[PDB]
Amino acid sequence: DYVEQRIDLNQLLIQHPSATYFVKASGDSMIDGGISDGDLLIVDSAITASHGDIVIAAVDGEFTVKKLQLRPTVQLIPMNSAYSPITISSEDTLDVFGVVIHVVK
Amino acid sequence: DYVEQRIDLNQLLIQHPSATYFVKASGDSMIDGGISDGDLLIVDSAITASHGDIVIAAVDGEFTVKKLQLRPTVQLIPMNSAYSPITISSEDTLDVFGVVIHVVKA
């Protein structure tokens, strides 16, 4: 007869358990993207970011969660009309620490 | 004759170039420890933190630079009398992202 397999969120939401962590989002520079102040972002640091991905990054030593743009130029763009983009020029340092894979609201 | 061997900060300050990054400190929860709002902290993510090390960590998804205490209990303690400690209980999650190896003031 049937056997009830209990729910396992780690198997459901995490591909790389050893390179995945959660970051709490802040502010609302990313609301239009579904992220809001307080949510938990599930971050995978074992995958390489891509144009379009939402990433936890450090620009000039300060952390942020932004959308990665690699073309036409490397930038960190918000998802809230009120905010303005951040271009990563040569005098600027960009550090990508992982790709946000899920947002837990 | 003699040839001047140009200064190289990376060789001088960085042991693991590929696992080292810089974070800018915030607030003054760590002034008595030499860190002040604005400084660059050179972080080595290739060495495992130890009791006493100052680290970049996330407690319940929020990042911080604190001093790691593994004994008598696991905590994140400031270095400013005005601030109070943070214990890492079972209902809390602690994530250590690297040991601060140097503080660069300006």
UniProtKB/Swiss-Prot annotation, chain A:
Keywords: Autocatalytic cleavage, DNA damage, DNA repair, Hydrolase, Protease, Serine protease, SOS mutagenesis, SOS response. Signal peptide: none annotated. The active site is at 29 (for autocatalytic cleavage activity), 66 (for autocatalytic cleavage activity). GO terms for biological process: DNA repair; proteolysis; regulation of DNA-templated transcription; SOS response. Its EC number is 3.4.21.-. GO terms for molecular function: DNA binding; serine-type peptidase activity. Belongs to the peptidase S24 family. Involved in UV protection and mutation. Essential for induced (or SOS) mutagenesis. May modify the DNA replication machinery to allow bypass synthesis across a damaged template. This is Protein UmuD. The gene is umuD. The chain holds residues 32 to 136 of 139 of the full protein.
